[PDB]
Design a protein around this nucleic acid. Structure first.
Ligand code: NAD
Lengths: 151, 50, 16, 473, 101, 51, 101
DNA sequence: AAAAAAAAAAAAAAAA
């Protein structure tokens, strides 16, 4: 069963925001998968990325920034996410998160232009509550809130 | 201007800096002689800056 | 007066 | 070779009862203890200084990044951190014209100049407090920098612009916050440069107060003060024992009355019924004659301790089981003779002396990094050294710049377990609500007591002052 | 069947009036669709808007102000509304709202 | 303790003090910030605390 | 400089008209970019399309047909073309070509 | 008027 949320991003550039967002979502009871979340790296990671995207991810969150806009890892994750979206027949699968004020909506990647993006540019908490409303509206699988898990 | 292998009197712009100590003997914990660290600067290496 | 300063001992360390 | 024992790092408590060593990271992920719906802020200052405050407030609405996120956690935005609304829409502005400022500024008498500059602000603040519908949680006083240049003792106003009271201290901050004690108005003074500093430049072209690498921590430490002054609980201690009152006693001089008169002030902390911690001042300032005696007469000492014990009864119901009086100075025997009289049988009274005077500095043999924070060389059952300022791995660096110096802690009288004493002072070093840092180098009792003493000795006409720290820090 | 009231408007500027009107209509029992309240996150927004106008929109409400006259996004929805007006044979489909004096 | 007093003036003064002192202590000596202070008063008071 | 003409279309359905139009335009002397033109494909073409649209295209011709009307790749290309039209301040940028009755 | 052994008031610099 698909009950995991994937957060794609630029690992050495957008790490602070992804850390905050992941630690908040897991604190709220949402299962989150991210590369920075797991400690240690090995050659199996690349195959595991596509495996988890195609087998376990229920919502795909793409951190949108002037870094992660045109990054090859981000592009490949977005492409496999798009294929999973077509296979699952779920339009509301890729949920962009625009966090860069210098990344206007008119310069976004082609796969993301036609998608409604949660605005994180002004207030991170407003973006977080929008993410929530999207999640309970779309009935994303969720466990009871527990901040101790995030701790 | 260096004892052992480490400098004790050096240069900083027009001011020559010196490593200095201050002495104080105390007998409470053990009979010991405490040493502090200070840095003082001179314009010619002989006269301190007033 | 001893020319080597009093040496102490800590059981706890760290690395840069 | 002498052993050094290391004290486990105390943990502070955050929302949902979750523990975290760092306060910045604890607030960033868990948020504050109580829900403060919003900070309805009032700002007073020049209309030029209002634009700066508005810009800075909108700036801290957005997340702010430091240079090195490992050494300094980034700021995730005010309302995300604190679950509290603090916008630049809805600020009550009381304009202070520049001409009125220059009218007071250009005076030869520093005492009168400071008095008039403070009066100009306080009159408008009190008028807005009394005669306005708007409710303001905290009054942000945005002062220009020429004020700070020429509004403190030993500041010489140059002859060229001198164009033209003695019962009040010439410190703008101290005497300012001293005159608002009758009205209990929480205020936060900002320099105009401490705000959007990028405007103020020097001759070379680099800003005088460069916070470019540390802008995020600036936001962290301003936001925490603003949240505390509005009535919020940012964090809380979790290792405090039941029934332990602490009290922090500091002596400050009073330059106005003949003979400094050595005013004493006290700050108290204990646990409350439930789990809440009560950290309020214990302010009955007990003046002590003589130039430098720094030892209170039996009457004043008894009054102080009786106020401390009653301020514990009225909140818990019965007397503290262990009172740990800290102090920067060692006491004479007469003071304990006074204390023990009012001290009941069940309560255990311990006096603790903490000093930075002794020059011990443990240098590590290899590496350009200082000793770890927490190391304690216990000389004997009563005296010890504690390294409150030092290296801690979480911040990746040390809290000092050069090789730090420890805190000399000793038990004057009383019995006290010295390890327990070192285990509580390190806990006391974390509750600095005026700054959002990892930990403080000295226990908060001796620092907030010093702050309130520095505020209460700026005005002579204080009577029954508030005990809440939001009116002081 | 179509039982929705597309309150088209200028998204950044006319948020306040549009939200007030949408809340008032929802309180009265009228099903309402608008981007700031009802548009889904992470969905094809023009495709969803076009589907809503073409299929489930019972009536079209245009919030006309100084911003909404030359606003391209509102004009595209207005054109789709005119086309579905032709298809539905209902002259009273589009009701412009004048809120700017 | 204050209400069952025959002297109406001393009764009302002491009863007013019993509330205002606590409210002032809360305002001055507490960290919390309260916008408005609601004073719930019983009914025997209104029966016997007015001229 | 922008001197290439981009022709968006439905790849498996509108090959005949797109082929005829492209082969006519190239013969007429107009630089033409189209996916049926280049022989062989790789993973790079997804970014190639976007960069060509945003940096080299001077006119964007949309083959309008019942197949290309709601084709996901066609819609994505059309959205990028709309953004480029906004950026370039040139209204006569997208020139749709309707070939279906 | 020295001393040691203990005191706070004040100003400057630098990261925090
Ligand atoms: N998700 C949206 O809010 C959204 C998207 C497209 C169009 N619109 C609409 O625009 C109208 C008219 O105003 P307009 O011409 O200024 O349109 P517009 O596209 O310029 O709308 C402006 C607002 O929506 C934009 N927007 C939000 N999410 C976006 C995304 N994922 N991609 C691209 N842009 C995004 C901007 O953020 C901006 O805040 C409408 O009546 C309307 O429904 C709204």
């Amino acid at each position: 069963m698909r009950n995991k949320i994937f957060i794609s991003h630029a690992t050495p550039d957008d790490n602070d925001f992804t850390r905050w967002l992941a630690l908040k979502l897991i604190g709220l009871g949402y299962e989150v998968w991210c590369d920075i979340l797991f400690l240690d790296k090995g050659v199996d990671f690349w195959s595991n990325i596509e495996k988890v995207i195609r087998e376990d991810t229920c919502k795909f969150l793409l951190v949108s920034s002037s870094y992660s806009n045109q990054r090859e890892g981000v592009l490949k994750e977005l492409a496999v996410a798009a294929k999973v979206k077509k296979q699952l027949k779920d339009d509301k699968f890729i949920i962009p998160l625009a966090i860069d004020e210098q990344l206007s909506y008119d310069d976004i990647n082609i796969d993301i232009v036609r998608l409604n993006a949660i605005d994180f540019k002004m207030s991170w908490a407003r973006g977080l509550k929008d993410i929530l409303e999207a999640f309970e509206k779309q009935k994303v699988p969720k466990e009871v809130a527990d901040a101790s898990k995030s701790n | 201007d260096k004892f052992e292998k480490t400098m004790l009197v050096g240069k900083q712009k027009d001011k020559n800096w010196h490593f200095a100590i201050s002495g104080a003997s105390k007998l409470y914990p053990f009979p010991v002689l405490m040493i502090s660290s200070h840095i003082f600067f001179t314009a010619d290496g002989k006269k301190l800056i007033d | 007066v001893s020319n080597e300063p009093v040496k102490f001992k800590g059981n706890v360390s760290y690395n840069i | 070779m002498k052993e050094l024992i290391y004290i486990e790092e105390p943990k502070i408590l955050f929302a949902h009862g979750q523990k975290c060593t760092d306060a910045r990271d604890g607030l960033a992920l868990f948020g504050p203890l109580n829900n403060l719906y919003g900070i309805k802020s009032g700002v007073i200052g020049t209309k030029q200084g209002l634009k700066i405050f508005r810009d800075y407030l909108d700036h801290i609405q957005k997340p702010i990044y430091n240079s090195n996120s490992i050494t300094r956690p980034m700021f995730p935005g005010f309302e995300a951190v604190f679950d509290c609304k603090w916008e630049s829409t809805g600020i009550t502005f009381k304009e202070v014209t520049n001409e009125d400022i220059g009218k007071f500024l250009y005076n030869s008498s520093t005492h009168k100049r400071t008095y008039d500059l403070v009066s100009l602000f306080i009159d408008k603040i009190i008028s807005a407090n009394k005669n306005e519908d708007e409710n303001v949680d905290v009054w942000f006083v945005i002062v220009p920098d020429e004020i700070y240049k020429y509004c403190r003792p030993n500041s010489v106003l140059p002859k060229e612009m001198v164009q033209t009271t003695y019962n009040y201290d010439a410190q703008f901050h101290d005497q300012f916050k001293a005159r608002l004690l009758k009205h209990t108005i929480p205020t936060q003074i900002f320099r105009e440069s401490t705000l959007a500093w990028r405007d103020f430049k020097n001759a070379f072209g680099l800003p005088i107060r460069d916070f470019s690498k540390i802008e995020g921590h600036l936001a962290w430490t301003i936001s925490t003060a603003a949240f505390y002054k509005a009535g919020g609980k940012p964090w809380k201690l979790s290792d405090v024992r039941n029934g332990v009152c602490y009290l922090g006693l500091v002596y400050k001089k009073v330059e106005k009355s003949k003979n400094p008169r050595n005013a004493c002030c006290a700050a108290q902390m204990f646990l409350d019924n439930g789990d809440g911690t009560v950290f309020k001042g214990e302010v009955g300032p007990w003046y002590n004659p003589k130039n430098g005696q720094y030892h209170l007469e039996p009457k004043e000492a008894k009054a102080l301790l009786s106020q401390s014990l009653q301020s514990y009864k009225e909140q818990i119901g019965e007397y503290p089981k262990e009172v740990f009086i800290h102090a920067k100075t060692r006491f004479n025997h007469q003071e304990w003779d006074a204390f023990l009289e009012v001290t009941p049988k069940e309560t255990n009274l311990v006096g603790v002396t903490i000093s930075k005077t002794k020059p011990l500095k443990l240098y590590k043999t290899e590496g350009d990094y200082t000793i770890l924070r927490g190391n304690a060389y216990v000389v004997n059952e009563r005296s010890a050294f504690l390294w409150t300022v030092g290296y801690v791995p979480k911040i990746q660096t040390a809290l000092s710049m050069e090789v730090p110096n420890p805190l000399f802690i000793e038990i004057n009288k009383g019995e006290a377990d010295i390890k327990q004493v070192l285990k509580d002072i390190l806990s006391l070093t974390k509750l600095n609500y005026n700054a959002c840092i990892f930990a403080d180098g000295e226990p908060v009792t001796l620092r907030f007591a010093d702050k309130i003493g520095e505020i209460l000795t700026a005005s002579t006409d204080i009577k029954t002052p508030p005990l809440a720290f939001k009116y002081y820090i």
